Amino acid sequence: SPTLVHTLKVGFYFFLWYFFNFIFNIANKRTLNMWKYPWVLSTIQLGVGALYCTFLWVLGLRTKPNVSKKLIKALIWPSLGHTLGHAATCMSFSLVAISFTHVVKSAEPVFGAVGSALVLGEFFHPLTYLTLVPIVSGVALSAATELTFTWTGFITAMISNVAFVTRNITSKFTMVDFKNEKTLIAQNTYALITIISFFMELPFALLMEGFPPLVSAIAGVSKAKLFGSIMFCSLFYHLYNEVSYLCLDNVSPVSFSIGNTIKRVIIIFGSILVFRTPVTRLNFIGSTIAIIGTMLYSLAKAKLP
Amino acid sequence: SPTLVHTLKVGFYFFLWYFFNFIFNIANKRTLNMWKYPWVLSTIQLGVGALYCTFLWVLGLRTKPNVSKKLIKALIWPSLGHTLGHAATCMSFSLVAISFTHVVKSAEPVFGAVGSALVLGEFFHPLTYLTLVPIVSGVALSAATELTFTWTGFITAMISNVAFVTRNITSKFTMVDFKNEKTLIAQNTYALITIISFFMELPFALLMEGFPPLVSAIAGVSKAKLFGSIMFCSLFYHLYNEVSYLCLDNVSPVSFSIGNTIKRVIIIFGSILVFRTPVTRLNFIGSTIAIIGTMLYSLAKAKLP
Numbered sequence: 016s017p018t019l020v021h022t023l024k025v026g027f028y029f030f031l032w033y034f035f036n037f038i039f040n041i042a043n044k045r046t047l048n049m050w051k052y053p054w055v056l057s058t059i060q061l062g063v064g065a066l067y068c069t070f071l072w073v074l075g076l077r078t079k080p081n082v083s084k085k086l087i088k089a090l091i092w093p094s095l096g097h098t099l100g101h102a103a104t105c106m107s108f109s110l111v112a113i114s115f116t117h118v119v120k121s122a123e124p125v126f127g128a129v130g131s132a133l134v135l136g137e138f139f140h141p142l143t144y145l146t147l148v149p150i151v152s153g154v155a156l157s158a159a160t161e162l163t164f165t166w167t168g169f170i171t172a173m174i175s176n177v178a179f180v181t182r183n184i185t186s187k188f189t190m191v192d193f194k195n196e197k198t199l200i201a202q203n204t205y206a207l208i209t210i211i212s213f214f215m216e217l218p219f220a221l222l223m224e225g226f227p228p229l230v231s232a233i234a235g236v237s238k239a240k241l242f243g244s245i246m247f248c249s250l251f252y253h254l255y256n257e258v259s260y261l262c263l264d265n266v267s268p269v270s271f272s273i274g275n276t277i278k279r280v281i282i283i284f285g286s287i288l289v290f291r292t293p294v295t296r297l298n299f300i301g302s303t304i305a306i307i308g309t310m311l312y313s314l315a316k317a318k319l320p
Numbered sequence: 321s322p323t324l325v326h327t328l329k330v331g332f333y334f335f336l337w338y339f340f341n342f343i344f345n346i347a348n349k350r351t352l353n354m355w356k357y358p359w360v361l362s363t364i365q366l367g368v369g370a371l372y373c374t375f376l377w378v379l380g381l382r383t384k385p386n387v388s389k390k391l392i393k394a395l396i397w398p399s400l401g402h403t404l405g406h407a408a409t410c411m412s413f414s415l416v417a418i419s420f421t422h423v424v425k426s427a428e429p430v431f432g433a434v435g436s437a438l439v440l441g442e443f444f445h446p447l448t449y450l451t452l453v454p455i456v457s458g459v460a461l462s463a464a465t466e467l468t469f470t471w472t473g474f475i476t477a478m479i480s481n482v483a484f485v486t487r488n489i490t491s492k493f494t495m496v497d498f499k500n501e502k503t504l505i506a507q508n509t510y511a512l513i514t515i516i517s518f519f520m521e522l523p524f525a526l527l528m529e530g531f532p533p534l535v536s537a538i539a540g541v542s543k544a545k546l547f548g549s550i551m552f553c554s555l556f557y558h559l560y561n562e563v564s565y566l567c568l569d570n571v572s573p574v575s576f577s578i579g580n581t582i583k584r585v586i587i588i589f590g591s592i593l594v595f596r597t598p599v600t601r602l603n604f605i606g607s608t609i610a611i612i613g614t615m616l617y618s619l620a621k622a623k624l625p
């Protein structure tokens with residue numbers, strides 16, 4: 016029984032991750048619909064999370080990390096990957112239906128397995144190449160039938176697969192190396208990442224968008240409602256990422272990506288219902304085949320030498 | 321020397337393979353321009369090779385093979401792969417510029433390594449997945465900028481990668497298992513394949529297209545000139561494939577496919593010049609990156625366990 020309640024405790028982290036992430040995705044897309052500034056919005060989301068984390072430390076509500084030069088050095092690559100994936104995915108969100116962005120990002124486990132096997136010196140059974148056929152075909156069919164398709168929206172989402180996988184792998188290194196450091200709990204690892212990532216993205220966001228005026232592109236929406244929407248999705252952006260690092264603490268980076276693909280089925284189903292996204296038969300079939308393929312790919316990589 | 325004279329003789333076979341195949345590709349596309357019946361034309365090409373081989377046997381110009389029940393059984397899957405790839409590529413030739421057909425088929429060595437590793441039980445180094453990025457990106461960019469792109473022309477060419485790789489691997493097994501059968505020289509192996517393949521394709525060609533009228537769609541071409549064009553490309557279709565089986569007899573199925581990609585660079589350059597194919601900057605760049613990635617894939621696969 017205790018082993019089962021532990022898995023139920025870990026599974027509950029996954030639920031919270033999915034639950035916060037769905038609330039975030041809906042509110043984030045609604046923010047972008049009336050305030051199309053992906054660079055500044057994504058930077059604000061990191062800043063809100065950075066501020067939230069410092070207050071927890073200041074108030075003594077969260078253990079303060081034993082910060083060292085060795086730890087900051089070991090978090091640069093996790094923060095580089097987080098910043099790039101965050102800015103790329105927000106750009107994708109701003110250009111296409113977010114259901115499509117998540118279809119592209121559903122192939123994350125393949126990038127995760129390749130990067131992890133590269134680092135671990137593992138080899139791939141040839142049958143994993145066979146499972147690439149439905150993955151590549153499914154994404155290609157999904158993109159070719161996606162009504163909101165743009166090349167930049169597709170490529171930024173694909174780039175985020177690479178950035179987040181490096182983040183997850185390098186973050187997993189650090190969490191294992193500092194496993195004895197009782198103060199570096201999972202939330203503190205992500206807390207330091209969102210602080211570093213904020214200053215990493217801030218100069219770029221100011222360069223390409225400056226200071227956008229707080230004006231809704233949807234007529235009739237007050238500035239108070241727009242500001243509230245920015246803060247709301249910024250809060251849940253941080254909460255889902257923070258809880259996800261508890262999940263990352265408990266699984267391998269590849270299992271974390273498999274957990275992300277399961278998350279994305281939920282986000283895709285939820286977002287197309289909330290936004291009444293038009294979906295043709297071929298688009299349904301392409302996206303479903305792509306996601307079946309990445310699961311079969313993970314199944315093949317796991318069950319073969 | 322004795323190994324060197326052999327590699328020079330083999331190198332001369334590769335030259336005839338490339339030379340005959342270029343003459344074939346030009347004439348074949350000119351015939352399809354006048355007479356757009358890929359099923360019947362591809363079936364005729366197998367039959368002319370069948371007839372050419374039987375005349376060599378009847379006139380005592382080539383040793384007759386001792387055909388046995390076991391040999392025929394061993395040549396069914398080679399003939400299935402040959403028939404399918406032949407009909408698929410000819411269909412592709414008739415729908416798009418043949419330079420684009422060969423760009424898609426330039427990824428053949430990837431299909432070759434996978435199928436070869438599937439049978440041999442080898443595993444793939446993680447770096448080979450990284451080389452897939454320029455391959456997928458280059459083929460996608462090429463397809464997205466190809467003036468003559470059709471989905472059918474792209475898919476039939478991609479399917480031919482699977483069929484021909486199946487043909488090469490199963491043919492290589494047959495040639496190895498029957499190496500001690502002195503009458504089964506490389507040309508006799510392909511001769512039997514083109515006979516079986518002809519009768520495999522013949523019923524489908526009649527069902528698909530019936531008996532096409534021998535009338536040129538291009539003005540000023542008599543029936544005799546159209547007939548002569550059909551025989552001409554049929555002769556060099558057989559000559560390039562027959563000489564290619566001497567190459568296959570002396571190299572691995574993967575090395576054969578790598579030799580095919582080198583051939584396709586020559587065919588692409590020559591066909592765009594002969595046909596004055598419009599090629600934009602992005603299209604040349606995509607096609608070059610796709611073929612560069614295939615050679616990098618082959619390098620990573622060969623240079624890493």
Ligand SMILES: CCCCCCCC/C=C\CCCCCCCC(=O)OC[C@H](O)CO
Pocket residue numbers: 122125126147150151152154155156158159160164165166456460464
């Ligand atoms: C293992 C990881 C797999 C992930 C890799 C998946 C493979 C994606 C390949 C090609 C998609 C890009 C081609 C896009 C398909 C056609 C869509 C399109 O370009 O449509 C025209 C557009 O509407 C006009 O702007």
Ligand SMILES: CCCCCCCC/C=C\CCCCCCCC(=O)OC[C@H](O)CO
Pocket residue numbers: 151155159427430431452455456459460463464465469470471474
């Ligand atoms: C080993 C790897 C083998 C190579 C794997 C290659 C994967 C390429 C993926 C998709 C190509 C097709 C998608 C791009 C098609 C966009 C062009 C397009 O659809 O344009 C509309 C057309 O003009 C009107 O029919």
